[PDB]
């Protein structure tokens, strides 16, 4: 809610969840170095037990948007999240149609 | 936290010890993944099962378990009536 930019900065297929996942990528880019420090103090068994419990409590209060496990690739053309290919940012189907028409460079029908 | 070498999962809870003899309302929590530490053995919890808050009275035998292990989320499946 508070992470959604007041002015849309997306140029692809916009969607309720596409706009939601884009806000989690920006929130994580700003807080990743901070989240990496908390995860380093928790796994450092040389620090006092109190220092590890403080970092362990603050990592729980972080907003869900700050977690990297919340990020999930989506289709820039259709906005789906099921059956995505990392190499094209599209679903398996949108990749098929664009590959046949020649809009995806280098891809061709395979026969052997 | 499964691995023992990095302590148990602790969550910010208002676990304030009661004044001698004072009446304390049970602690309402949705953190079903909070390990039952020894420091609140004897307090009254109200764990969220998704829809309702099922009361719980921590004892010395529950230490180590999670708060969600005592609040059933689904209802027993019964064929017929």
């Amino acid at each position: 809610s508070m992470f959604r930019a007041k002015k849309l900065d997306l140029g692809c297929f916009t969607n309720v969840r596409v706009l939601r996942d884009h806000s989690k990528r920006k929130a994580f880019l700003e807080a990743e170095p901070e989240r990496q420090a908390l995860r380093y103090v928790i796994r450092n068994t040389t620090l006092p037990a109190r220092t590890r419990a403080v970092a362990q409590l603050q990592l729980t209060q972080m907003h869900a948007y700050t977690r990297p496990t919340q990020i999930r690739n989506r289709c820039i053309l259709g906005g789906k999240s099921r059956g995505i290919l990392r190499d094209f940012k599209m679903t398996r189907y949108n990749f098929r149609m664009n590959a046949l028409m020649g809009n995806i460079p280098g891809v061709k029908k395979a026969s052997w | 936290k499964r691995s023992v070498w990095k302590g148990p999962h602790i969550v910010p809870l208002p676990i304030q010890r009661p004044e001698p003899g004072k009446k304390i309302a049970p602690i309402r929590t949705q953190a079903r993944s909070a390990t039952i530490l020894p420091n609140f053995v004897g307090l009254k919890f109200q764990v969220h099962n998704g829809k309702d808050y099922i009361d719980l009275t921590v004892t010395e035998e529950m230490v180590g378990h999670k708060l969600g292990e005592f609040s059933a989320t689904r209802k027993p499946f019964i064929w017929g009536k």
């Binding site: 037990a49 109190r50 409590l57 | 910010p12 676990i15 530490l37 420091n39």
Partner: peptide
């Protein structure tokens, strides 16, 4: 020596919006 105060110390009322 005790870490119990940390749990209640960080326990900010209204943590979960609403109840």
């Amino acid at each position: 020596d005790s870490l119990t105060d940390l749990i209640s110390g960080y326990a900010t009322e209204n943590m979960n919006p609403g109840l």
